[PDB]
PDB file of N, CA, C and O in Angstrom:
ATOM      1  N   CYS A 255      99.605 144.074 100.549  1.00 39.82           N
ATOM      2  CA  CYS A 255      99.440 144.309  99.602  1.00 39.82           C
ATOM      3  C   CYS A 255      99.453 142.214  98.514  1.00 39.82           C
ATOM      4  O   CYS A 255      99.885 141.976  99.111  1.00 39.82           O
ATOM      5  N   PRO A 256      99.221 142.298  97.265  1.00 40.17           N
ATOM      6  CA  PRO A 256      98.786 141.107  96.923  1.00 40.17           C
ATOM      7  C   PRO A 256     100.474 140.561  96.687  1.00 40.17           C
ATOM      8  O   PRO A 256     101.230 141.372  96.860  1.00 40.17           O
ATOM      9  N   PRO A 257     100.171 139.230  95.941  1.00 39.24           N
ATOM     10  CA  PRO A 257     101.555 138.688  95.778  1.00 39.24           C
ATOM     11  C   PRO A 257     102.054 139.137  94.210  1.00 39.24           C
ATOM     12  O   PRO A 257     100.994 139.692  93.193  1.00 39.24           O
ATOM     13  N   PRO A 258     103.190 138.867  93.925  1.00 38.70           N
ATOM     14  CA  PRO A 258     103.680 139.308  92.187  1.00 38.70           C
ATOM     15  C   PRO A 258     102.946 137.791  91.618  1.00 38.70           C
ATOM     16  O   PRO A 258     102.299 137.152  91.715  1.00 38.70           O
ATOM     17  N   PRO A 259     103.682 138.209  90.137  1.00 38.19           N
ATOM     18  CA  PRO A 259     103.170 137.498  89.067  1.00 38.19           C
ATOM     19  C   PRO A 259     104.082 135.744  89.433  1.00 38.19           C
ATOM     20  O   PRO A 259     105.016 136.191  90.270  1.00 38.19           O
ATOM     21  N   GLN A 260     104.057 134.955  88.861  1.00 40.98           N
ATOM     22  CA  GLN A 260     104.740 133.835  88.525  1.00 40.98           C
ATOM     23  C   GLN A 260     104.843 132.647  90.349  1.00 40.98           C
ATOM     24  O   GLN A 260     104.898 131.493  90.432  1.00 40.98           O
ATOM     25  N   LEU A 261     103.723 133.543  91.199  1.00 41.43           N
ATOM     26  CA  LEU A 261     103.696 132.819  92.366  1.00 41.43           C
ATOM     27  C   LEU A 261     102.132 133.068  92.094  1.00 41.43           C
ATOM     28  O   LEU A 261     101.427 132.178  92.895  1.00 41.43           O
ATOM     29  N   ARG A 262     101.112 133.197  91.573  1.00 39.92           N
ATOM     30  CA  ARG A 262      99.772 132.399  90.997  1.00 39.92           C
ATOM     31  C   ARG A 262      99.811 131.364  91.158  1.00 39.92           C
ATOM     32  O   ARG A 262      97.727 130.575  91.596  1.00 39.92           O
ATOM     33  N   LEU A 263     100.455 130.500  91.286  1.00 41.33           N
ATOM     34  CA  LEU A 263     100.453 128.893  91.969  1.00 41.33           C
ATOM     35  C   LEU A 263      99.711 129.110  93.048  1.00 41.33           C
ATOM     36  O   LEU A 263      98.771 128.236  93.386  1.00 41.33           O
ATOM     37  N   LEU A 264     100.337 129.617  94.749  1.00 39.47           N
ATOM     38  CA  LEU A 264      99.828 129.792  95.464  1.00 39.47           C
ATOM     39  C   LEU A 264      98.210 130.189  95.281  1.00 39.47           C
ATOM     40  O   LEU A 264      97.234 129.859  96.307  1.00 39.47           O
ATOM     41  N   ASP A 265      97.875 131.043  94.230  1.00 41.07           N
ATOM     42  CA  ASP A 265      96.215 130.809  94.770  1.00 41.07           C
ATOM     43  C   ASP A 265      95.431 129.914  93.931  1.00 41.07           C
ATOM     44  O   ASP A 265      94.902 129.869  94.605  1.00 41.07           O
ATOM     45  N   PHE A 266      95.853 129.170  92.685  1.00 42.29           N
ATOM     46  CA  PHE A 266      95.473 128.598  92.554  1.00 42.29           C
ATOM     47  C   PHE A 266      95.388 127.608  93.529  1.00 42.29           C
ATOM     48  O   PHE A 266      93.844 126.801  93.510  1.00 42.29           O
ATOM     49  N   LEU A 267      96.510 126.534  94.240  1.00 37.34           N
ATOM     50  CA  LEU A 267      96.140 125.831  95.441  1.00 37.34           C
ATOM     51  C   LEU A 267      95.287 126.448  96.705  1.00 37.34           C
ATOM     52  O   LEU A 267      94.811 125.499  97.092  1.00 37.34           O
ATOM     53  N   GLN A 268      95.539 127.464  96.430  1.00 37.02           N
ATOM     54  CA  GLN A 268      94.585 128.034  98.134  1.00 37.02           C
ATOM     55  C   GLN A 268      92.913 127.911  97.365  1.00 37.02           C
ATOM     56  O   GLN A 268      92.224 127.392  98.280  1.00 37.02           O
ATOM     57  N   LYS A 269      92.420 128.462  96.536  1.00 36.10           N
ATOM     58  CA  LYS A 269      91.820 128.158  96.046  1.00 36.10           C
ATOM     59  C   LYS A 269      90.811 126.740  95.929  1.00 36.10           C
ATOM     60  O   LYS A 269      89.616 127.014  95.789  1.00 36.10           O
ATOM     61  N   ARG A 270      91.701 125.953  95.170  1.00 41.05           N
ATOM     62  CA  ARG A 270      91.586 124.389  94.897  1.00 41.05           C
ATOM     63  C   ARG A 270      91.439 124.117  96.166  1.00 41.05           C
ATOM     64  O   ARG A 270      90.135 123.014  96.190  1.00 41.05           O
ATOM     65  N   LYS A 271      91.780 123.876  97.172  1.00 42.27           N
ATOM     66  CA  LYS A 271      91.977 123.019  98.667  1.00 42.27           C
ATOM     67  C   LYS A 271      90.494 122.875  98.898  1.00 42.27           C
ATOM     68  O   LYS A 271      90.155 122.058  99.647  1.00 42.27           O
ATOM     69  N   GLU A 272      89.523 124.735  99.205  1.00 42.25           N
ATOM     70  CA  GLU A 272      88.268 124.423  99.871  1.00 42.25           C
ATOM     71  C   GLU A 272      87.601 123.528  99.388  1.00 42.25           C
ATOM     72  O   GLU A 272      86.431 123.202 100.205  1.00 42.25           O
ATOM     73  N   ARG A 273      87.394 123.080  97.845  1.00 40.29           N
ATOM     74  CA  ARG A 273      86.536 122.453  97.188  1.00 40.29           C
ATOM     75  C   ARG A 273      86.255 121.310  97.994  1.00 40.29           C
ATOM     76  O   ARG A 273      84.669 121.518  98.395  1.00 40.29           O
ATOM     77  N   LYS A 274      86.820 120.330  98.154  1.00 37.57           N
ATOM     78  CA  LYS A 274      86.203 119.148  98.570  1.00 37.57           C
ATOM     79  C   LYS A 274      87.061 117.675  99.007  1.00 37.57           C
ATOM     80  O   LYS A 274      88.203 117.941  98.017  1.00 37.57           O
ATOM     81  N   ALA A 275      87.062 116.927  99.576  1.00 37.56           N
ATOM     82  CA  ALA A 275      88.095 116.101  99.650  1.00 37.56           C
ATOM     83  C   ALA A 275      87.130 114.680  99.763  1.00 37.56           C
ATOM     84  O   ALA A 275      86.208 114.528 100.669  1.00 37.56           O
ATOM     85  N   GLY A 276      87.604 113.952  99.040  1.00 37.86           N
ATOM     86  CA  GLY A 276      86.610 112.025  98.726  1.00 37.86           C
ATOM     87  C   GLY A 276      87.119 111.503  98.283  1.00 37.86           C
ATOM     88  O   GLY A 276      87.956 111.786  96.869  1.00 37.86           O
ATOM     89  N   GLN A 277      86.896 110.302  98.492  1.00 38.28           N
ATOM     90  CA  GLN A 277      87.009 109.133  97.205  1.00 38.28           C
ATOM     91  C   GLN A 277      86.237 108.010  97.714  1.00 38.28           C
ATOM     92  O   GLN A 277      86.558 107.581  99.146  1.00 38.28           O
ATOM     93  N   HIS A 278      85.799 107.299  97.300  1.00 37.32           N
ATOM     94  CA  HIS A 278      85.248 105.961  97.514  1.00 37.32           C
ATOM     95  C   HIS A 278      86.409 104.940  97.613  1.00 37.32           C
ATOM     96  O   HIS A 278      87.379 105.061  96.622  1.00 37.32           O
ATOM     97  N   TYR A 279      85.712 103.769  98.235  1.00 41.13           N
ATOM     98  CA  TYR A 279      86.762 102.731  98.029  1.00 41.13           C
ATOM     99  C   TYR A 279      88.459 103.175  98.281  1.00 41.13           C
ATOM    100  O   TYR A 279      89.477 102.725  97.252  1.00 41.13           O
ATOM    101  N   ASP A 280      88.641 103.796  99.010  1.00 39.17           N
ATOM    102  CA  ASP A 280      90.048 104.388  99.951  1.00 39.17           C
ATOM    103  C   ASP A 280      90.690 103.322 100.517  1.00 39.17           C
ATOM    104  O   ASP A 280      90.331 102.768 101.203  1.00 39.17           O
ATOM    105  N   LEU A 281      91.674 102.839  99.594  1.00 36.93           N
ATOM    106  CA  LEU A 281      92.963 101.395 100.103  1.00 36.93           C
ATOM    107  C   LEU A 281      93.738 101.915 100.705  1.00 36.93           C
ATOM    108  O   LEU A 281      94.213 101.028 101.699  1.00 36.93           O
ATOM    109  N   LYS A 282      93.981 103.006 100.831  1.00 35.59           N
ATOM    110  CA  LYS A 282      95.071 103.672 101.825  1.00 35.59           C
ATOM    111  C   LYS A 282      94.842 103.102 103.238  1.00 35.59           C
ATOM    112  O   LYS A 282      93.877 103.646 103.740  1.00 35.59           O
ATOM    113  N   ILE A 283      96.166 103.113 104.409  1.00 38.80           N
ATOM    114  CA  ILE A 283      95.741 102.816 105.592  1.00 38.80           C
ATOM    115  C   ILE A 283      96.839 103.231 106.050  1.00 38.80           C
ATOM    116  O   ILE A 283      97.008 103.231 107.803  1.00 38.80           O
ATOM    117  N   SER A 284      97.300 104.397 105.772  1.00 38.86           N
ATOM    118  CA  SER A 284      98.789 105.424 106.181  1.00 38.86           C
ATOM    119  C   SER A 284      99.098 106.301 106.020  1.00 38.86           C
ATOM    120  O   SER A 284      98.401 106.811 104.376  1.00 38.86           O
ATOM    121  N   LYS A 285      99.229 107.005 106.906  1.00 39.94           N
ATOM    122  CA  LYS A 285      99.256 108.938 106.621  1.00 39.94           C
ATOM    123  C   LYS A 285     100.405 108.623 106.470  1.00 39.94           C
ATOM    124  O   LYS A 285     100.933 109.851 105.636  1.00 39.94           O
ATOM    125  N   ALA A 286     101.767 107.936 107.550  1.00 42.97           N
ATOM    126  CA  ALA A 286     103.101 108.162 107.180  1.00 42.97           C
ATOM    127  C   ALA A 286     103.552 107.213 106.138  1.00 42.97           C
ATOM    128  O   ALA A 286     104.967 106.711 105.671  1.00 42.97           O
ATOM    129  N   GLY A 287     102.263 106.701 104.869  1.00 43.39           N
ATOM    130  CA  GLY A 287     103.285 106.214 104.318  1.00 43.39           C
ATOM    131  C   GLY A 287     104.113 106.692 103.536  1.00 43.39           C
ATOM    132  O   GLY A 287     104.476 106.171 102.223  1.00 43.39           O
ATOM    133  N   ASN A 288     104.235 108.329 103.195  1.00 42.71           N
ATOM    134  CA  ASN A 288     104.660 108.837 102.553  1.00 42.71           C
ATOM    135  C   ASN A 288     106.229 109.153 103.114  1.00 42.71           C
ATOM    136  O   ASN A 288     106.947 110.309 103.545  1.00 42.71           O
ATOM    137  N   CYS A 289     107.039 107.885 103.603  1.00 44.66           N
ATOM    138  CA  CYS A 289     108.410 108.447 103.779  1.00 44.66           C
ATOM    139  C   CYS A 289     109.619 108.031 103.349  1.00 44.66           C
ATOM    140  O   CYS A 289     109.195 107.525 102.362  1.00 44.66           O
ATOM    141  N   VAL A 290     110.664 108.211 103.432  1.00 43.63           N
ATOM    142  CA  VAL A 290     111.485 107.857 102.658  1.00 43.63           C
ATOM    143  C   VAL A 290     112.445 106.894 102.742  1.00 43.63           C
ATOM    144  O   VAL A 290     112.557 105.621 101.676  1.00 43.63           O
ATOM    145  N   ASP A 291     113.271 106.610 103.826  1.00 39.11           N
ATOM    146  CA  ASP A 291     113.937 104.961 104.350  1.00 39.11           C
ATOM    147  C   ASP A 291     113.052 104.005 104.626  1.00 39.11           C
ATOM    148  O   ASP A 291     112.819 103.602 105.504  1.00 39.11           O
ATOM    149  N   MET A 292     112.428 103.904 103.658  1.00 42.93           N
ATOM    150  CA  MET A 292     111.246 102.604 103.587  1.00 42.93           C
ATOM    151  C   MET A 292     112.244 101.357 104.148  1.00 42.93           C
ATOM    152  O   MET A 292     111.667  99.837 104.163  1.00 42.93           O
ATOM    153  N   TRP A 293     113.477 101.538 103.636  1.00 42.36           N
ATOM    154  CA  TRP A 293     114.625  99.893 103.721  1.00 42.36           C
ATOM    155  C   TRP A 293     114.556  99.686 105.319  1.00 42.36           C
ATOM    156  O   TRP A 293     114.298  98.194 105.191  1.00 42.36           O
ATOM    157  N   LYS A 294     114.125 100.325 106.157  1.00 39.70           N
ATOM    158  CA  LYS A 294     114.555 100.244 107.729  1.00 39.70           C
ATOM    159  C   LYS A 294     113.877  99.299 108.129  1.00 39.70           C
ATOM    160  O   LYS A 294     112.641  98.889 107.352  1.00 39.70           O
ATOM    161  N   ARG A 295     114.091  98.015 108.516  1.00 38.72           N
ATOM    162  CA  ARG A 295     113.849  97.442 109.486  1.00 38.72           C
ATOM    163  C   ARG A 295     114.151  96.883 111.222  1.00 38.72           C
ATOM    164  O   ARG A 295     115.056  96.804 110.792  1.00 38.72           O
ATOM    165  N   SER A 296     112.910  96.928 112.032  1.00 38.51           N
ATOM    166  CA  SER A 296     113.483  97.050 113.357  1.00 38.51           C
ATOM    167  C   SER A 296     113.590  95.341 113.646  1.00 38.51           C
ATOM    168  O   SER A 296     113.649  94.460 112.924  1.00 38.51           O
ATOM    169  N   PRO A 297     114.476  95.532 114.395  1.00 38.54           N
ATOM    170  CA  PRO A 297     115.089  93.859 114.838  1.00 38.54           C
ATOM    171  C   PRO A 297     114.042  93.038 115.711  1.00 38.54           C
ATOM    172  O   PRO A 297     113.919  93.575 116.369  1.00 38.54           O
ATOM    173  N   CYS A 298     113.255  92.222 114.943  1.00 39.20           N
ATOM    174  CA  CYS A 298     112.353  91.456 115.280  1.00 39.20           C
ATOM    175  C   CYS A 298     112.966  90.103 115.483  1.00 39.20           C
ATOM    176  O   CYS A 298     113.717  89.377 115.065  1.00 39.20           O
ATOM    177  N   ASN A 299     112.370  90.109 117.014  1.00 34.31           N
ATOM    178  CA  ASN A 299     112.392  88.807 117.910  1.00 34.31           C
ATOM    179  C   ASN A 299     111.507  87.650 117.771  1.00 34.31           C
ATOM    180  O   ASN A 299     110.349  87.870 117.994  1.00 34.31           O
ATOM    181  N   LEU A 300     111.010  86.453 116.829  1.00 36.66           N
ATOM    182  CA  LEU A 300     110.163  85.938 116.935  1.00 36.66           C
ATOM    183  C   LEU A 300     109.920  84.300 117.487  1.00 36.66           C
ATOM    184  O   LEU A 300     111.567  84.170 118.068  1.00 36.66           O
ATOM    185  N   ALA A 301     108.950  84.302 118.169  1.00 32.07           N
ATOM    186  CA  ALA A 301     109.137  83.127 119.209  1.00 32.07           C
ATOM    187  C   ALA A 301     108.451  81.602 118.594  1.00 32.07           C
ATOM    188  O   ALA A 301     107.950  81.889 117.220  1.00 32.07           O
ATOM    189  N   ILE A 302     109.436  80.924 119.138  1.00 32.70           N
ATOM    190  CA  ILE A 302     109.507  79.353 118.521  1.00 32.70           C
ATOM    191  C   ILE A 302     108.215  79.190 118.313  1.00 32.70           C
ATOM    192  O   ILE A 302     107.714  78.805 119.418  1.00 32.70           O
ATOM    193  N   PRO A 303     108.192  78.271 116.593  1.00 35.98           N
ATOM    194  CA  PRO A 303     106.958  77.797 116.986  1.00 35.98           C
ATOM    195  C   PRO A 303     106.869  76.323 117.251  1.00 35.98           C
ATOM    196  O   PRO A 303     107.910  75.461 117.946  1.00 35.98           O
ATOM    197  N   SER A 304     105.514  76.014 117.643  1.00 32.29           N
ATOM    198  CA  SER A 304     105.859  74.971 118.539  1.00 32.29           C
ATOM    199  C   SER A 304     105.525  73.683 118.080  1.00 32.29           C
ATOM    200  O   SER A 304     106.405  72.779 118.521  1.00 32.29           O
ATOM    201  N   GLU A 305     104.772  73.861 116.684  1.00 30.28           N
ATOM    202  CA  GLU A 305     105.665  72.228 115.920  1.00 30.28           C
ATOM    203  C   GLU A 305     105.693  72.096 114.432  1.00 30.28           C
ATOM    204  O   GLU A 305     104.614  72.747 114.048  1.00 30.28           O
TER     205      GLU A 305
END
């Protein structure tokens, strides 16, 4: 059986997704760029510069 009203948004999204995906000059280099705790930093040990 179909869905009720107020959920037609699912229909819109389903039909829209199929159309296509593309963009020229795509500057993103991260799939996980949508994280939350972006403030965390791993403890990094630098090597002593020569001079």
